[PDB]
Amino acid sequence: VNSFSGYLKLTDNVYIKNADIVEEAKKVKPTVVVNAANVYLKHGGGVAGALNKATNNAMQVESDDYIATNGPLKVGGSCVLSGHNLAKHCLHVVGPNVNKGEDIQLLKSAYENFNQHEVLLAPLLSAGIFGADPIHSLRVCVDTVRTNVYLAVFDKNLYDKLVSSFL
Numbered sequence: 745v746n747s748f749s750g751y752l753k754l755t756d757n758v759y760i761k762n763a764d765i766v767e768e769a770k771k772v773k774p775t776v777v778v779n780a781a782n783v784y785l786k787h788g789g790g791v792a793g794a795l796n797k798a799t800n801n802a803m804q805v806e807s808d809d810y811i812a813t814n815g816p817l818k819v820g821g822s823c824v825l826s827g828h829n830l831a832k833h834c835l836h837v838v839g840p841n842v843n844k845g846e847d848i849q850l851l852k853s854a855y856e857n858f859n860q861h862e863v864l865l866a867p868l869l870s871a872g873i874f875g876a877d878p879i880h881s882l883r884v885c886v887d888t889v890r891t892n893v894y895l896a897v898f899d900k901n902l903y904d905k906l907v908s909s910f911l
């Protein structure tokens with residue numbers, strides 16, 4: 745049993761809810777929250793900007809030190825950093841950004857990072873301002889992630905479309 749509430753069950757391991765990922769993290773304090781990161785860990789907008797704002801910019805400060813030491817992530821890659829006030833850990837995962845021309849086949853590699861964690865609170869990778877089709881992102885998630893993933897979909901309209909089109 746875990747603390748996640750109000751989710752619709754899609755599969756054995758994937759759950760979904762219409763929720764503000766920031767507000768969900770603040771309530772649950774999950775072991776892992778996933779950030780929709782870019783390779784520079786520049787948390788300007790979208791899910792990343794919202795998560796970082798909720799940490800009072802402490803996520804960005806930590807991220808800048810990580811990049812100064814290690815250099816940029818790979819598209820499809822990840823790193824584990826602090827979850828600050830939102831979670832124990834933040835898994836920063838880089839899905840391909842269609843608005844930068846990145847290979848959508850890298851979305852499966854991005855979701856494979858989730859398999860290193862038994863339970864996660866996450867957004868749909870490459871959705872929103874990353875430009876991919878969220879229906880596609882949900883299908884890759886279900887077909888790639890084997891650990892238990894609780895998806896927070898910010899848009900009520902999109903949530904209803906994801907559920908009503910789910911195969």
Ligand SMILES: Oc1ccc2c(c1)OCO2
Nearest residue numbers: 764765790791794872898
């Ligand atoms: O994709 C998003 C998810 C949550 C957000 C957001 C964007 O901006 C405000 O909070």
